[PDB]
mmCIF file of C-alpha atoms and ligand atoms in Angstrom:
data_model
loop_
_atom_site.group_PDB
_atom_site.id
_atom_site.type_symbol
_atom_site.label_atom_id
_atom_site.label_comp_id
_atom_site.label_asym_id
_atom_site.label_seq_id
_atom_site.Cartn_x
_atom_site.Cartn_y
_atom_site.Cartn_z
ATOM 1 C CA UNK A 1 47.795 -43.819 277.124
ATOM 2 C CA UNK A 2 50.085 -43.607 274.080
ATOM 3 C CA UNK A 3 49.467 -45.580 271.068
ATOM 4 C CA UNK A 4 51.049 -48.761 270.280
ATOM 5 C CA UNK A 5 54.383 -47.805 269.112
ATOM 6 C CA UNK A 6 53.441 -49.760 265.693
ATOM 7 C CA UNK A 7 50.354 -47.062 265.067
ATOM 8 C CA UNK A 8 52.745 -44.329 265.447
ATOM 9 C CA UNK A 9 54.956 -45.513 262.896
ATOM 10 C CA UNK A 10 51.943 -46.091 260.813
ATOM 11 C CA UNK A 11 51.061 -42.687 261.180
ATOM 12 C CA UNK A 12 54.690 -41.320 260.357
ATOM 13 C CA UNK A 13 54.356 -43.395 257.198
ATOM 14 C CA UNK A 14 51.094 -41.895 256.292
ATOM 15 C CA UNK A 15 52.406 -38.112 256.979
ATOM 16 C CA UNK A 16 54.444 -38.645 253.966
ATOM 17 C CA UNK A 17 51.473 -38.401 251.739
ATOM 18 C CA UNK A 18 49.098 -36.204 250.874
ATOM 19 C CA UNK A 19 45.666 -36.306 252.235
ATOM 20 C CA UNK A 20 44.080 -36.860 248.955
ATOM 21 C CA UNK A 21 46.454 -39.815 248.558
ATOM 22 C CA UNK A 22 45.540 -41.766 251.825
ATOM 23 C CA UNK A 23 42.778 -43.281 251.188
ATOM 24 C CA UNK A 24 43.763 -44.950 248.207
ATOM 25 C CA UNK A 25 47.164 -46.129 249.179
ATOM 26 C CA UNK A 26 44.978 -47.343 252.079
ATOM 27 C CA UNK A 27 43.337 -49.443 249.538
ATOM 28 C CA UNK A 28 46.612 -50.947 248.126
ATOM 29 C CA UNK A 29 48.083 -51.224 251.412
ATOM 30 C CA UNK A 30 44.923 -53.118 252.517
ATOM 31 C CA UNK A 31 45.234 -55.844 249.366
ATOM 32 C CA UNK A 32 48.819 -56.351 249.675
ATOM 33 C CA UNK A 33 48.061 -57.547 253.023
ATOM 34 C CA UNK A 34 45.675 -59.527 252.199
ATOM 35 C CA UNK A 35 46.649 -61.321 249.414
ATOM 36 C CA UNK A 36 50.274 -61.911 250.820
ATOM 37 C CA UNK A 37 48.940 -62.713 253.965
ATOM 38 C CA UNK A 38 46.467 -65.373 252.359
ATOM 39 C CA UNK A 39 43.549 -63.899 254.763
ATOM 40 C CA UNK A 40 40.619 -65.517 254.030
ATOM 41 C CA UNK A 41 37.997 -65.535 256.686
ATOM 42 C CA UNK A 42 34.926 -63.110 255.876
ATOM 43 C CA UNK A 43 35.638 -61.614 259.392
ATOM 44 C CA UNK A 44 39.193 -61.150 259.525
ATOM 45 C CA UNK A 45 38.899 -59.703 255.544
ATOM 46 C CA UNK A 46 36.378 -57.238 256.239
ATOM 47 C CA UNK A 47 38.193 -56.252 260.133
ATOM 48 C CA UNK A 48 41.286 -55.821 256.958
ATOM 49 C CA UNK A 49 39.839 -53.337 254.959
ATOM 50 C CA UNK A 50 37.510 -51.680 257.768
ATOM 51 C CA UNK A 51 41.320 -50.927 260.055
ATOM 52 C CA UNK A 52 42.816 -49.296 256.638
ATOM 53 C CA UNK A 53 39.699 -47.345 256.294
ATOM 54 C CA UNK A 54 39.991 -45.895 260.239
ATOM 55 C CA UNK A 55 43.771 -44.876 259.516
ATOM 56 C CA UNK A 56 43.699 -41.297 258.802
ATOM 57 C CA UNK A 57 40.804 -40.348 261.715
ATOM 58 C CA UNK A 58 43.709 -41.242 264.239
ATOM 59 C CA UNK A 59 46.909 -40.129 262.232
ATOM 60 C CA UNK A 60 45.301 -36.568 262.135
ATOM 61 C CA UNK A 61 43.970 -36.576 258.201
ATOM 62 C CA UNK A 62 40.581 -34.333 260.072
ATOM 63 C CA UNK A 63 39.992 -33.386 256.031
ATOM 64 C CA UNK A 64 39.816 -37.145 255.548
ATOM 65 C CA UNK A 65 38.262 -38.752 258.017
ATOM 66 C CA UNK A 66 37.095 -41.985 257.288
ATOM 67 C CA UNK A 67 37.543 -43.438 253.730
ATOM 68 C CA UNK A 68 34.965 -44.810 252.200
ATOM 69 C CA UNK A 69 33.792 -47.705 251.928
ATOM 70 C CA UNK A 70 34.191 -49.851 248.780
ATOM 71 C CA UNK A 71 33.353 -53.196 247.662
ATOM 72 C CA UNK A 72 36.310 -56.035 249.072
ATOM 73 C CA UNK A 73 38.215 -57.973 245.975
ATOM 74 C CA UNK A 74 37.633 -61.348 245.647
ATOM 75 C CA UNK B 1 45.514 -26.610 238.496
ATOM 76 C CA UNK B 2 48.345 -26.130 236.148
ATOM 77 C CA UNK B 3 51.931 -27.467 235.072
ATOM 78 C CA UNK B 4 53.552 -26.106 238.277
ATOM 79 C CA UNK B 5 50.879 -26.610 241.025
ATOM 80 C CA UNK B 6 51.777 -29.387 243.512
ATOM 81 C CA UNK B 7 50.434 -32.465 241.815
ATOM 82 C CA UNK B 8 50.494 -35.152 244.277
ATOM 83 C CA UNK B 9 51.753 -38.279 242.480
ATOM 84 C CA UNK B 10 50.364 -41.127 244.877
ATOM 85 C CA UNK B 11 51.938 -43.998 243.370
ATOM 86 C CA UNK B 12 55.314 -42.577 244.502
ATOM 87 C CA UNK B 13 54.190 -41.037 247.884
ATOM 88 C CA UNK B 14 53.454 -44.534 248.732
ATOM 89 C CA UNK B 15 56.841 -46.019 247.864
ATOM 90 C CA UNK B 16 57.983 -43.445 249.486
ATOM 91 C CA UNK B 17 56.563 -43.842 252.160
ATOM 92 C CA UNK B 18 57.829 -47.343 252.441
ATOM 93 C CA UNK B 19 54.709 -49.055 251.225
ATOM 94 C CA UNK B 20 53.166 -48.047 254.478
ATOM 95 C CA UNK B 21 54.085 -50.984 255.771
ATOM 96 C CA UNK B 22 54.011 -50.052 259.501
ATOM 97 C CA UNK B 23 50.197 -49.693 258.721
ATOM 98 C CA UNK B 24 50.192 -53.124 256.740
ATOM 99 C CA UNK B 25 51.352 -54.354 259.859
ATOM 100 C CA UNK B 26 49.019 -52.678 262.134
ATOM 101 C CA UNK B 27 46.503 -53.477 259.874
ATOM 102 C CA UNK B 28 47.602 -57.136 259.545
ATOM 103 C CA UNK B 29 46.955 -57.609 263.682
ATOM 104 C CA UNK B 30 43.681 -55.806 263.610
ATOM 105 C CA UNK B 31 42.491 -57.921 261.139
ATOM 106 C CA UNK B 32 43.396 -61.516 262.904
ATOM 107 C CA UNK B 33 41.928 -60.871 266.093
ATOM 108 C CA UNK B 34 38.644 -59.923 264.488
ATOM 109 C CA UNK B 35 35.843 -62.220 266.471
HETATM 110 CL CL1 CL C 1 49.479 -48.349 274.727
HETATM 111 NA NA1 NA C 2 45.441 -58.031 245.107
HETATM 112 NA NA1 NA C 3 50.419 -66.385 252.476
HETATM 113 NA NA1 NA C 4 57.011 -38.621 248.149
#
């Protein structure tokens, strides 16, 4: 099937930046939601930061891939 | 490098790019149906 017509917007978004760029506005994306979303649960945090990390395999970023992983906030 | 090469300035890419927040969104939903 398609994607989710949400993940292709996503991935619109994320074509407007440079590869080298993605994984750490991935990052800040990932806290903002987090902290204005008040997500708390240690599943639900990490399932946060994990999806953010995954973003550039499917939006086409192949010189990317997968950012790494680093330690949650808080 | 050098004073004309492309320098990416990612701070403003992501305003730029709205914040990403169709991604905060998508991210957002992936992260509250986790278990
Ligand atoms: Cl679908
Ligand atoms: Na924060
Ligand atoms: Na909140
Ligand atoms: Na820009």
């Amino acid at each position: 099937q398609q994607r989710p017509p949400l993940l292709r917007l996503c991935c619109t978004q994320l074509h407007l930046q440079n590869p080298q760029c993605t994984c750490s506005t991935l990052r800040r994306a990932a806290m903002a939601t987090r902290t204005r979303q008040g997500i708390q649960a240690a599943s639900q945090v990490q399932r946060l930061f994990e999806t953010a990390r995954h973003l550039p395999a499917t939006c086409s970023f192949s010189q990317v891939g997968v950012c790494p992983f680093v330690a949650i906030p808080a | 490098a050098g004073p004309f090469g492309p320098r990416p300035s990612c701070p403003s890419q992501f305003v730029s790019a709205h914040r990403l927040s169709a991604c905060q969104i998508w991210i957002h939903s992936e992260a509250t149906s986790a278990g």
